[PDB]
Amino acid sequence: XXRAX
Amino acid sequence: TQSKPTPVKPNYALKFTLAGHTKAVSSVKFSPNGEWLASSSADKLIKIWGAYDGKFEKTISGHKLGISDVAWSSDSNLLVSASDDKTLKIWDVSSGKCLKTLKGHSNYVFCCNFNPQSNLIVSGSFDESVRIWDVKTGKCLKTLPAHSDPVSAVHFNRDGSLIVSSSYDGLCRIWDTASGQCLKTLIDNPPVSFVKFSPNGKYILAATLDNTLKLWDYSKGKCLKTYTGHKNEKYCIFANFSVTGGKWIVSGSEDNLVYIWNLQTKEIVQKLQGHTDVVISTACHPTENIIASAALENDKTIKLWKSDC
Known part of the structure; x- marks a missing residue:
């Protein structure tokens, strides 16, 4: 991944 | 101790790419x-x-979907991970094995941390809650209806009596660990993409998606320092206090650089060049002047940088 997109 | 060393600038230089x-x-x-x-x-x-030396040691696997965050226990023996598969996992680092799967969140788990004692884990999720978990049993102890949008960060203070959380709702909240009740809300409200307590326990460093980092005295609701010049309007980028040599603020950036500020003067003292994508994460070594950075899809590497001060 959520943090990654 | 005749003299106090007062560096004006660090000299981080690339040593390893992982x-x-x-x-x-x-x-x-x-x-x-x-x-x-x-x-x-x-x-x-x-x-x-x-x-x-950045030497590869091992791969740890088991999550069914991507992982957004990982954190160490105080004794360096355990890791916890937060995953899109809606669970956190506790790992024994030595064996590489999963010890517990923490189930309860109803959407992506975004962020995680042990408390100093490491008997508890705190998590934040797209489900808009903050959860507190018993490490020993893997059970959820408390569920806080913490925010009204995904929770981007969670961090315990130095004795684990407080939790700070940040959210896309624009708020930063401080929670009493024992009761789960909110102690304070700090509030225009752009998404707050990262928060953490300072090494001394007195301040919170908070990032917002308007290209801004701010140092807050939370028990007073007062902003003491502000850091800018970098690019951050999209991703939840980690920020750090560097305290092993000079006092710096360190952060990744959406222009593929690592930014380093003088904590007091707020001036940029160095920008680390090398990554080929957004620098999503940075970390400072606990005792040595070493910075680790990591980047997104067009890069996929971790870089180790070392300085003299």
């Missing part, structure tokens, strides 16, 4: 004992590297 992840790296963290660096990735994997 490849191995097959998708975007999401987070890097140095073990408290200074021995290891742990990395999480959209590739569903956690990897462990030598903190000083």
